[model samples]
Target: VRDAYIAQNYNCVYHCARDAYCNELCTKNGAKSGSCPYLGEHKFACYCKDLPDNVPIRVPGKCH
Candidate 1:
């Protein structure tokens, strides 16, 4: 039922600070799509597709 949310995973990116940037990167990184937003220590984050393997968030940038 929660597959909708589970299918999405977001990571952080400091070098790139914008929704468009994150969105493009996410798709390139094997995700369906992505978005950048502020949350905790992560000034910008990429919301993208969740990988099959136990993928961890807060990569390519610092995360809370």
Candidate 2:
């Protein structure tokens, strides 16, 4: 996960609308706080529990 972020020049995961909501809920459940890119403005604001340890890796369809 860390390697993927470095390769993409990202310090952290980018959270979308779903992420924001998840973060909020996670926090309410006693999770930590942090930020993500996808949720701009509301940027970098999230709960630690909102983050996942493993994410599926996929190649572009054309690459296959």
Candidate 3:
């Protein structure tokens, strides 16, 4: 359940950034595959790249 959300979030973040390195780095730090957006701090936070607003919508635990 949690894993799904992580994967989804990570996918969005990865695509938005268009940086495989960042995606891989996030994965290495227990950011999961789709829940990176839910991670407000710690290693998950490290993968984020500054960008304009109106990014993907993040609904924690929404993935099933």
Q: Write the per-residue lDDT of candidate 3 for residues 1-64, one digit (tens) a residue.
A: 1222223343333332434555565455454432243335432432433221333333443333
Report how far residue 51 has shifted in candidate 1, in Å: 3.6
Q: Count backbone clashes in candidate 2.
A: 5
Error of 2 at 13 (Å): 19
lDDT-wise, the better of 1 and 3 is: 1
Question: Candidate 2 on 2-55: residue-level lDDT in tens?
Answer: 211110112333343666564554444444543344555334433343323453
> For model 1, how does the per-residue alpha-carbon lDDT over 13-33 read when each residue is reduced to its tens digit?
434466777657666656676
lDDT for predicted candidate 1 compared with the true structure: 0.47
Clash list (residue pairs), candidate 2: 14-37, 32-48, 35-44, 35-45, 36-44
lDDT of each: 0.47, 0.35, 0.36
Runs of candidate 1 exceeding 4 Å displacement: 1-14, 39-43, 59-64
- Worst 10-residue lDDT window for candidate 3 reads 1-10
- What TM-score goes with each of the models? 0.49, 0.26, 0.25
lDDT of 2: 0.35
Supply candidate 3's per-residue lDDT for 25.
Answer: 53
